[PDB]
Design an enzyme around this catalytic site. Structure first.
Site: not given
Ligand SMILES: [Mg+2]
Ligand SMILES: [Zn+2]
Ligand SMILES: CC(C)Cn1c(=O)n(C)c(=O)c2nc[nH]c21
Length: 338
Positions: A79, A115-116, A75
């Site tokens: 990614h 999103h992360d 992460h």
């Molecule tokens: Mg996530």
């Molecule tokens: Zn993700």
């Protein structure tokens, strides 16, 4: 504009499914997100839609990238760049272009990018068991996802030079913000089956019924009419980001293997920490001393990937992804050797 040669070459054919995301990672020295982001966002003319400076965009992409932990095996910003790449690839599909509005596209590309953000390399269940501050802040509910969306908006609107939404009209922004949040929240896995099943029941089944009447005159109109409702575009957007998010198994074999190594190492880290702190182990199977990565991938693919991409492919037509998924599934199977 002015981008070092190697990086310019790495961003080769970002329009193709087969893309060397790791060469971009190396060429950009762990800053793939700002480079692919600027190009992708330009190809989609996003500032020209949000009325932002290509300079304000750079500042935005830069601050979001910096909040992705390089120390995470999986992460990290690479990614995110990868998910952004899959998202653009999906948006570029006929079915998607013929169904989503430009504002949905903007929501999708932005959602993918953020999103992360600030992901800690630990699962929601870990933060909850530990009583982590984020778990307390979000009442143990969709902890990380709420955080990615929230932190993202705090970083964006917290500084004029980063605020790519500054020159938008309240209503437009309001709708774009809700769309972005919805997509980020839709990435929480505990809701996986709910999201996939709704897509199947509201998109694939009704559409197959209408496509039975052939592809004649008003038939198509009835089809396009049904798919474009706000409710359905939302379900389509949720499916799009979910599929982009876990699309590693549908990538060229070399990439598929690398992604599996990265996520596995991230999970092993957590398992070592859980037992160390005596915390309840959530991923007993994901122990570096007991877990078979190929078998784990096989299970993962059978449980989440297979049916979800089945549905997505039927709706969008993605032979490339399905062929890669088959080849990769066979590879993990072929590694048994025992
Ligand atoms: Mg996530
Ligand atoms: Zn993700
Ligand atoms: C179970 C799932 C939600 C988490 N999960 C997983 O278990 N494996 C093995 C992956 O490769 C993976 N990639 C994204 N999420 C993943």
């Amino acid at each position: 504009d002015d981008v070092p040669p190697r990086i310019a070459r790495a961003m080769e054919n970002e329009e193709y499914w087969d893309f060397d995301i790791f060469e971009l990672e190396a060429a950009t020295h762990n800053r793939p997100l700002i480079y692919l982001g600027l190009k992708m966002f330009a190809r989609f003319g996003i500032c020209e839609f949000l009325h932002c400076s290509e300079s304000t965009l750079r500042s935005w992409l830069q601050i979001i990238e910096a909040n992705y932990h390089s120390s995470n095996p999986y992460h990290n910003s690479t990614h995110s760049a990868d998910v952004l790449h899959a998202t653009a690839y999906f948006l570029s599909k006929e079915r998607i272009k013929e169904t989503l509005d430009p504002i949905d596209e903007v929501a999708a590309l932005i959602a993918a990018t953020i999103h992360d953000v600030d992901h800690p390399g630990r699962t929601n269940s870990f933060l909850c068991n530990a009583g982590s501050e984020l778990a307390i802040l979000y009442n143990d509910t969709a902890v990380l996802e709420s955080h990615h969306a929230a932190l993202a908006f705090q970083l964006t609107t917290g500084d004029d030079k980063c605020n790519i939404f500054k020159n938008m009209e309240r209503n437009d922004y309001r709708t774009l913000r809700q769309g972005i949040i919805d997509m980020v929240l839709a990435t929480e896995m505990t809701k996986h089956f709910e999201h996939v099943n709704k897509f199947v029941n509201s998109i694939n089944k009704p559409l197959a019924t209408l496509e039975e009447n052939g592809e004649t005159d008003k038939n198509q109109e009835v089809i396009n009419t049904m798919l474009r409702t706000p409710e359905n575009r939302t379900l389509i957007k949720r499916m799009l980001i979910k599929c982009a998010d876990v699309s590693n198994p549908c990538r060229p074999l070399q990439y598929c293997i690398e992604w599996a190594a990265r996520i596995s190492e991230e999970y092993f880290s957590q398992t070592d920490e859980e037992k160390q702190q005596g915390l309840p182990v959530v991923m007993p199977v994901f122990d570096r001393n007991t877990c078979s990565i190929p078998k784990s991938q096989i299970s993962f693919i059978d449980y989440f990937i297979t049916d979800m991409f089945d549905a997505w492919d039927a709706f969008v037509d993605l032979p490339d992804l399905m062929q890669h998924l088959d080849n990769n599934f066979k590879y993990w199977k072929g590694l048994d050797e025992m």
